[PDB]
């Protein structure tokens, strides 16, 4: 029956240390494959990077804003007929 006045640390030092990982040429191959899948699907039309953009005053520099807006064909035939954009 003893009393503690100083509270325990928020990070109590663990019992043992974590385990190192397994590495093979396939492992870094899959790592680079995931790193390129994420970057490419970030640069896909399916990825909506256009929530909405607000512009208060109009400028003359309208030449450096030629963004190509090509949506994928939604294929409404094999799609719910109720939903029509």
């Amino acid at each position: 029956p003893d009393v503690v006045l100083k509270p325990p640390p928020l990070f109590p030092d663990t019992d043992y240390k974590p385990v190192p990982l397994k590495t093979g040429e396939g492992e870094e191959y899959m790592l680079a494959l995931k790193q390129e899948l994420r970057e490419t699907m970030k640069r896909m039309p399916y990825f909506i990077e256009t929530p909405e953009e607000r512009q208060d005053i109009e400028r003359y520099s309208k030449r450096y804003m030629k963004v190509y807006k090509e949506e994928w064909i939604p294929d409404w035939r094999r799609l719910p007929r109720e939903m029509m954009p």
């Binding site: 009393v3 503690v4 006045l5 509270p7 325990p8």
Partner: protein, 49 residues
């Protein structure tokens, strides 16, 4: 230097009251001090916390 606009005194009414139960995580998030000691009074010069 210029002063920033600030509301003078926020006067509002109470619309409605909602009932809910908290989680231990939110309880710790709101809590300030963690009691670990059971001794109420210290056995020193005078009654002191």
């Amino acid at each position: 230097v210029k002063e920033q606009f600030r509301e003078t005194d926020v006067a509002k009414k109470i619309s409605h009251i909602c009932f809910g139960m908290k989680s231990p995580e939110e309880m710790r998030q709101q809590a300030h001090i963690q009691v670990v000691s059971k001794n109420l009074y210290s056995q020193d010069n005078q009654h002191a916390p």
